Amino acid sequence: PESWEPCVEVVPNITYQCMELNFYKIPDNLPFSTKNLDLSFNPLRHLGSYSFFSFPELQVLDLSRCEIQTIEDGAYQSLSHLSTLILTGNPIQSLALGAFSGLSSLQKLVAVETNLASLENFPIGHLKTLKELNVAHNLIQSFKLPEYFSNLTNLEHLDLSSNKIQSIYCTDLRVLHQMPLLNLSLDLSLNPMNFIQPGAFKEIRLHKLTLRNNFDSLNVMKTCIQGLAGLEVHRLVLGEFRNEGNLEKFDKSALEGLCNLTIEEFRLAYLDYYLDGIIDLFNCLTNVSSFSLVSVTIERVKDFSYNFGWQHLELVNCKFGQFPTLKLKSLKRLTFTSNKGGNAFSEVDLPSLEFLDLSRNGLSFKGCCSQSDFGTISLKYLDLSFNGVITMSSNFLGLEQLEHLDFQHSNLKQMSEFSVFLSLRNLIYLDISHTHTRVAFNGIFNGLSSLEVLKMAGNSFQENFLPDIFTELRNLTFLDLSQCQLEQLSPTAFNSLSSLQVLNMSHNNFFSLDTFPYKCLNSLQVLDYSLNHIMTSKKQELQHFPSSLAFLNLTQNDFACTCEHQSFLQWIKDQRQLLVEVERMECATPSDKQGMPVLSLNITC
Amino acid sequence: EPCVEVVPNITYQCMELNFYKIPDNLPFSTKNLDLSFNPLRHLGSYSFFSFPELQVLDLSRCEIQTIEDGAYQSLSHLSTLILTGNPIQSLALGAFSGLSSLQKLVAVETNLASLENFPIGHLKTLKELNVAHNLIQSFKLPEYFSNLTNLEHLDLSSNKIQSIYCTDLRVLHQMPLLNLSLDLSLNPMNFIQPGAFKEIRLHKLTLRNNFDSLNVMKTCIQGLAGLEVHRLVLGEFRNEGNLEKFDKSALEGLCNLTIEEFRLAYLDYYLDGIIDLFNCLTNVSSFSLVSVTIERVKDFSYNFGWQHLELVNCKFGQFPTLKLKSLKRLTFTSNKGGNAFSEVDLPSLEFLDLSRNGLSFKGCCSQSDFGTISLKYLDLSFNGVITMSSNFLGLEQLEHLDFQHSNLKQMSEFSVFLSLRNLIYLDISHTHTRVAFNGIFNGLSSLEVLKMAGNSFQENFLPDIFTELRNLTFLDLSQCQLEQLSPTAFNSLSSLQVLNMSHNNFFSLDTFPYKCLNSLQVLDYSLNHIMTSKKQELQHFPSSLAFLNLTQNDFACTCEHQSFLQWIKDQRQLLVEVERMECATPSDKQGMPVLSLNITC
Amino acid sequence: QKQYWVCNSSDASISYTYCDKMQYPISINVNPCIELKGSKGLLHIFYIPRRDLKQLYFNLYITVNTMNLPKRKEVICRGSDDDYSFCRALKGETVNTTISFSFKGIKFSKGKYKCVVEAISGSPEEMLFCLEFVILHQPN
Amino acid sequence: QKQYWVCNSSDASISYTYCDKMQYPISINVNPCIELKGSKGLLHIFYIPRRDLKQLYFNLYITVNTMNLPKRKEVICRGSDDDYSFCRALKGETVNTTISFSFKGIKFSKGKYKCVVEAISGSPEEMLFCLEFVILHQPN
Ligand SMILES: *[C@@H]1O[C@H](CO)[C@@H](O[C@@H]2O[C@H](CO)[C@@H](O)[C@H](O)[C@H]2NC(C)=O)[C@H](O)[C@H]1NC(C)=O
Ligand SMILES: *[C@@H]1O[C@H](CO)[C@@H](O[C@@H]2O[C@H](CO)[C@@H](O)[C@H](O)[C@H]2NC(C)=O)[C@H](O)[C@H]1NC(C)=O
Ligand SMILES: *[C@@H]1O[C@H](CO)[C@@H](O[C@@H]2O[C@H](CO)[C@@H](O)[C@H](O)[C@H]2NC(C)=O)[C@H](O)[C@H]1NC(C)=O
Ligand SMILES: *[C@@H]1O[C@H](CO)[C@@H](O[C@@H]2O[C@H](CO)[C@@H](O)[C@H](O)[C@H]2NC(C)=O)[C@H](O)[C@H]1NC(C)=O
Numbered sequence A: 001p002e003s004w005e006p007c008v009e010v011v012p013n014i015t016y017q018c019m020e021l022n023f024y025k026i027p028d029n030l031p032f033s034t035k036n037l038d039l040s041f042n043p044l045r046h047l048g049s050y051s052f053f054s055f056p057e058l059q060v061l062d063l064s065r066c067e068i069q070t071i072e073d074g075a076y077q078s079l080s081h082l083s084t085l086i087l088t089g090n091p092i093q094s095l096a097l098g099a100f101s102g103l104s105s106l107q108k109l110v111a112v113e114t115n116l117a118s119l120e121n122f123p124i125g126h127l128k129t130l131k132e133l134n135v136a137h138n139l140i141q142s143f144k145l146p147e148y149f150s151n152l153t154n155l156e157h158l159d160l161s162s163n164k165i166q167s168i169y170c171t172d173l174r175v176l177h178q179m180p181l182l183n184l185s186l187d188l189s190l191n192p193m194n195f196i197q198p199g200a201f202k203e204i205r206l207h208k209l210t211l212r213n214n215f216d217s218l219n220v221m222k223t224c225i226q227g228l229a230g231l232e233v234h235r236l237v238l239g240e241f242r243n244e245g246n247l248e249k250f251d252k253s254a255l256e257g258l259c260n261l262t263i264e265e266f267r268l269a270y271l272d273y274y275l276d277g278i279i280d281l282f283n284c285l286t287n288v289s290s291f292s293l294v295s296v297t298i299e300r301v302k303d304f305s306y307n308f309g310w311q312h313l314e315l316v317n318c319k320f321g322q323f324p325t326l327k328l329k330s331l332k333r334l335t336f337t338s339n340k341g342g343n344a345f346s347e348v349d350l351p352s353l354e355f356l357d358l359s360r361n362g363l364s365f366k367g368c369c370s371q372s373d374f375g376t377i378s379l380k381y382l383d384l385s386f387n388g389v390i391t392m393s394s395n396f397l398g399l400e401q402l403e404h405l406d407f408q409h410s411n412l413k414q415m416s417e418f419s420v421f422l423s424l425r426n427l428i429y430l431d432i433s434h435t436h437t438r439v440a441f442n443g444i445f446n447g448l449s450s451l452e453v454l455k456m457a458g459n460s461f462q463e464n465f466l467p468d469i470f471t472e473l474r475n476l477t478f479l480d481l482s483q484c485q486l487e488q489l490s491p492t493a494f495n496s497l498s499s500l501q502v503l504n505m506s507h508n509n510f511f512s513l514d515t516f517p518y519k520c521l522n523s524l525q526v527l528d529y530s531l532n533h534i535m536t537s538k539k540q541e542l543q544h545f546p547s548s549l550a551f552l553n554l555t556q557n558d559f560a561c562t563c564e565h566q567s568f569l570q571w572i573k574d575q576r577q578l579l580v581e582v583e584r585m586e587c588a589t590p591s592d593k594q595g596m597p598v599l600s601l602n603i604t605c
Numbered sequence B: 001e002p003c004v005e006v007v008p009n010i011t012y013q014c015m016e017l018n019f020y021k022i023p024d025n026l027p028f029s030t031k032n033l034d035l036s037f038n039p040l041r042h043l044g045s046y047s048f049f050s051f052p053e054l055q056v057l058d059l060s061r062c063e064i065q066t067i068e069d070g071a072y073q074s075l076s077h078l079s080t081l082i083l084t085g086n087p088i089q090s091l092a093l094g095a096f097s098g099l100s101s102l103q104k105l106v107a108v109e110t111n112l113a114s115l116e117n118f119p120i121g122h123l124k125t126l127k128e129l130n131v132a133h134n135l136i137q138s139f140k141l142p143e144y145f146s147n148l149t150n151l152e153h154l155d156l157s158s159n160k161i162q163s164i165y166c167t168d169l170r171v172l173h174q175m176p177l178l179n180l181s182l183d184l185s186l187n188p189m190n191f192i193q194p195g196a197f198k199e200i201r202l203h204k205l206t207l208r209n210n211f212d213s214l215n216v217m218k219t220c221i222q223g224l225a226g227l228e229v230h231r232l233v234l235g236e237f238r239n240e241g242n243l244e245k246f247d248k249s250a251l252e253g254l255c256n257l258t259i260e261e262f263r264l265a266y267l268d269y270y271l272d273g274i275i276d277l278f279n280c281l282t283n284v285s286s287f288s289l290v291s292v293t294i295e296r297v298k299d300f301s302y303n304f305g306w307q308h309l310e311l312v313n314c315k316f317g318q319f320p321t322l323k324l325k326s327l328k329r330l331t332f333t334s335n336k337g338g339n340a341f342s343e344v345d346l347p348s349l350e351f352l353d354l355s356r357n358g359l360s361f362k363g364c365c366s367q368s369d370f371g372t373i374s375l376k377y378l379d380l381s382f383n384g385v386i387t388m389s390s391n392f393l394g395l396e397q398l399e400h401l402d403f404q405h406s407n408l409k410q411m412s413e414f415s416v417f418l419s420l421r422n423l424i425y426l427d428i429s430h431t432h433t434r435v436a437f438n439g440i441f442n443g444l445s446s447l448e449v450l451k452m453a454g455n456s457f458q459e460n461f462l463p464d465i466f467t468e469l470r471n472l473t474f475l476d477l478s479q480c481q482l483e484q485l486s487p488t489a490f491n492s493l494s495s496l497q498v499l500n501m502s503h504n505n506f507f508s509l510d511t512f513p514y515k516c517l518n519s520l521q522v523l524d525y526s527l528n529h530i531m532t533s534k535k536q537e538l539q540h541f542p543s544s545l546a547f548l549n550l551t552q553n554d555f556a557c558t559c560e561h562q563s564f565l566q567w568i569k570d571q572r573q574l575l576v577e578v579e580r581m582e583c584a585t586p587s588d589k590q591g592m593p594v595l596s597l598n599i600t601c
Numbered sequence C, D: 001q002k003q004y005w006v007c008n009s010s011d012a013s014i015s016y017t018y019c020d021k022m023q024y025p026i027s028i029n030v031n032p033c034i035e036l037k038g039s040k041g042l043l044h045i046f047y048i049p050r051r052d053l054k055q056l057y058f059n060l061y062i063t064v065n066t067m068n069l070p071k072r073k074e075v076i077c078r079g080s081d082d083d084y085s086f087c088r089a090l091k092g093e094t095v096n097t098t099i100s101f102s103f104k105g106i107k108f109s110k111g112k113y114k115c116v117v118e119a120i121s122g123s124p125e126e127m128l129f130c131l132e133f134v135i136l137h138q139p140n
């Protein structure tokens, strides 16, 4: 029981959590070297001068939900190293002018739900180091940025979401026009926004504007978007919240005002309204370099065949009637993930495409894969995991540049009917784990000479036997054969794999541990043999492990702990320094010893 | 006899052996004689005197140019004669005299130029006539056809018939009771005389690949006006000349025949949509498309009156949206295109075969998937991923359900068959189901056949997942990686007759789980790794057990397992292929039949 | 250790307890009460979370008349521009929110369902709370 | 006994021998010759089967430089209203036909491919013929 208790020591000398411990005062029982202090949920109520004198080293200070009602001049005066101060959910009634003097290093100030009514009198003007101000969930009615904002030269994030702003006027942003270093992100979500004045954002430059769930109606939305005219935004995020008041209609005119801003990246994040189709909807965003829809519903996806100039398209957690037909000349990166509905993949035409993420859609793929499915010869990265049945009919013709291929948990078919990976001379990473591949062809991995990582857990092999299907895979460093119902190894399966570092043989059906097949694995560091049925091993077969082996996992096997197997049990003691979680290595038999840790075994042999 | 003895005293294969004449060294009691591919060249009188008992005489490709009077005179029992591919020059009237039992006459490719010069007018027993692949130019059926009063199948395909005139059909007009199926496929037809088929009734007409062009097709169909056909088969052949177009007008003339069943078998032309194309067939009771390509299939939302719809080996852009009020049976199998299942609305549907499409099926299965509450039969086998999200609400009348080899998901996330109180048959074999919920089979109180071979169980353990299934008579748990059984797994299964535990990973035979099985006749434990019987409950097999398959196991033939090894011999009556029970484990006994082993130590 | 009766419906009787040590007060109203045959309504929640709701998910351990279901993992907040506004909530922030819900399509056996709902959120993602729902199902 | 040389293309060199006792003459012609990088053409077959072609299918047993592929079953004739007219052809009947073919899009390893094609047909189905096709493939 230590001097810092009841607080929890997260990182000795450094980080202490004194959350919810009925502390009525800043504790005095902590190291002077403490950098991170969590004092959230304590009835501190009041913060007088030099309240944190005991913590000259503090960098992160959390005072969330501490019932703090008044903070006096100099309260933090000694904390010239503090970068993060968190004040969330304190009903602040009185906040002295010098409340935050001494905070010479403050980068992040979280004042969420601290009863803030106005930024004008909010005593932070002197914190020139401030990178982020979060004042969400307060009572601010005015987007008039006070003049001291001219001082906040490093401000990169300002969060004003969940306040009471109804209107934004041109003269509200007077201060911003004077201002140099602009990497400014602004969240204005969940303000009951009824009007933004045309001109208000003329010649304003923002990194990011988030405006979700601001608008009572479509017309109010249209009105307010017009007031953004001339805004220059790297990233614009529109949309609304599912658990929140939502727009009742949403037609082609809804985003017509976007034609008057300069937007590099666009996201629409959640829309309640079911879109019949997108004809004309996104006309102002045809040349945005990044276009993203999340959680929107679109019945007719026929209209995605339009040649937008997007370089990055992201469609996530959407519901589409059909798989979109995509013909995008400039698209480099496609993320189409976690979508529902129509879900048979159909050919896309994407000549610039290098990055393809098609995962987690439950997609069917009638005949995979080649340039003609995608329209590109430049693909480096293909993620087709967590989908439906993918029938292999082409061995990646035209996709010779692929470096990363993931089919994980997709039901692959026809995997043994030809060398389905033959074209892939540059593939570095392949995951065909849990694809229900039943290996019945020794040429299954022909072509994969650059392969470094091969995950194929949870498949199976003809005769539960591992044949020599790897001899061409010289550059392999990671191989996962766990859950493959393996019973026998070809003594030669692994001979060429002299770069292999991690071999996973977990959860297969081995009854003994034969080290011979592993003798040529000069780089082998990690060998996982857990969750097999290993009961014994002959002395001779235990001797061939490369000495590079650092982690052997033999946990959860069926060790027989009689004198008949003394050599194996002895060998296990001898290799203790290689063995992982020896606690979890238990005698399965005899019943005398069942449950007894193999290393602490009491036997006389 | 260089002839093969296929069935002693009965059937002999004298095929391709250089016979210049008919074998005389065969039993008098030969029923089936195959003399194909011999240079017989000539058949003189009583050529088959030696075979009074003959029923099936195959004479394919025997270079026969002439058949004399009474060639087959002795063969009063002959029901099938096969003359395929003989370059027949001379045929006299008595050529087929004496074939008073003859039901089937195959004269395919026999240099036949006319039916008029084909002496069969007296074979009144004749049921099938195949004169395909000849030189017949006229569809005129000779007067003697009126004597052929039992004829049911006439194959006139691959002949040279170009046109059909009314007077051609005279004989048939005088035979109103003839039940005729007629194949005219692959005749270069350019004309059918309107009126020629007025008051003609056919059981079946097949007209595949008869027409050069769409216009020729339409004109010849107009020539069919008035025909009554039970079953009309149109279409063409993948390896022949095919129609250049096929528009909505193609089948206009069909409005003027009475058709019970229609099939379009193979169409080379890719249809855009079927709007208007088939509206002459709106009230056909059975509608079938085979090997047709159709991109836009929303046209099936049209309210046709079909009672049976068959779509097989077609290519659709999209799964077709079917709204048909009267459809009782749907066969949508072996189709190979656009293939996510989408909701159909079929209120009369009792029989759904949706197998072998590689179909995707999100959120199976519910009355709102099919629009019927009368579904009795559901085949969703050999498909892609089927996700279970509804336990057959509104499908309580289902008796047969088949998912074999489709990838089933979410099977352990609730009781997926809960509603299926009337299901009798269930196949979920090879569905990649890992059983991890003990309520997986709740609801199945009437189930009698459960096949779930090729799946797996959490922990390779068989739990009490069957207690509700009192009516099971057939259970297949083979290939399921099973290692352990709940002793009470089969407790309630008193009607179980066949249990398949084959191809699992059991290392011992414990007969305890089987003791309450009064009805058990067949227990299959082949292809496991049984070496011992550990629980000396070797005694509690039910009296009813008649077939215990223990072949291809890993018997340990040492003194340590003498009891089990003895027991094996004690009831070799139950055991099935005793020889295929071989020692595995003492290497010096490896291979040896277990029932040959020396039981003294 | 107290039982918290949520609501009764035409189908269902719903209560919960805590399954964690630090049993933070939560307020859960459902209007109208869940009918297992299928229903729609509003879930009202009032909560002061002791971690950020960022990346909220539920592990659900469900039991049907003693029979365990495999764990389900239900992701509520994916991390970035989330559907639900409460995903933005911080440690100590008032969450007073209304969430709509809807479902149909599953017949449930009569009896007793437990649902251990293990909420997880934050950056070194830790447990927010654990509630154990008991739902008695009397069908029709 | 002998090697029947079918044709050479830019990609490939095709020949066959028999693998059954009953070495019935078939005439196989391909126009133009198969290029493995993809081709279309016409397969001309002249043959007289010693059984009906009903329910014809091929078991294909393919080898790539000594590496065996799993058996492929390729069904040619379903048995009722078949696509191909020769499905109708009887035991003693001259099959003189042209079958169009077309394919693309499989990279093949350099080397020697053998493909045993065992044709099977009829009800009570028996072996029609066995042909062992050798194809030598040198890409580009
Ligand atoms: C080898 O594969 C197995 C899965 O087959 C991995 O096992 C998982 O490991 C973590 C511990 O690191 C467990 O918490 C998971 O539950 C395990 N999954 C299981 C048992 O299915 C294992 O981590 C892999 N080994 C290596 C070195 O990567
Ligand atoms: C067997 O032991 C090793 C311990 O070294 C485990 O490997 C770790 O697995 C985790 C997660 O799976 C990885 O992120 C770590 O990198 C692995 N460590 C090393 C050194 O490779 C493995 O999980 C254990 N297997 C099982 C089934 O528990
Ligand atoms: C139990 O299931 C196995 C397959 O899991 C059946 O084995 C087949 O049996 C026939 C005839 O004995 C063999 O020729 C087949 O090759 C077998 N198939 C396989 C995959 O091995 C067995 O017949 C079933 N037993 C019973 C009684 O129905
Ligand atoms: C084990 O023996 C049994 C009983 O002799 C075999 O069962 C037969 O299997 C086939 C289909 O699999 C059925 O058509 C027969 O009706 C079954 N026979 C009986 C008597 O029911 C079984 O095939 C054998 N298993 C093997 C060889 O794996």
Ligand SMILES: *[C@@H]1O[C@H](CO)[C@@H](O)[C@H](O)[C@H]1NC(C)=O
Pocket: A125, A126, A127, A128, A151
């Ligand atoms: C800007 O911040 C400084 C702190 O260095 C403060 O003294 C001053 O009040 C602010 N600027 C102006 C113009 O007053």
Ligand SMILES: *[C@@H]1O[C@H](CO)[C@@H](O)[C@H](O)[C@H]1NC(C)=O
Pocket: B121, B122, B123, B124, B143, B144, B147
């Ligand atoms: C009809 O068949 C009988 C014998 O069955 C025969 O006597 C008669 O000549 C035949 N009639 C005609 C018109 O061929």
Ligand SMILES: *[C@@H]1O[C@H](CO)[C@@H](O)[C@H](O)[C@H]1NC(C)=O
Pocket: C046, C096, C097
């Ligand atoms: C929760 O929110 C509603 C709607 O904004 C508000 O009226 C109500 O008073 C709040 N409830 C509590 C308990 O604070």
Ligand SMILES: *[C@@H]1O[C@H](CO)[C@@H](O)[C@H](O)[C@H]1NC(C)=O
Pocket: D046, D096, D097
């Ligand atoms: C095969 O048929 C064609 C007509 O399609 C014909 O020209 C040719 O002579 C025939 N070949 C033989 C060998 O009979």
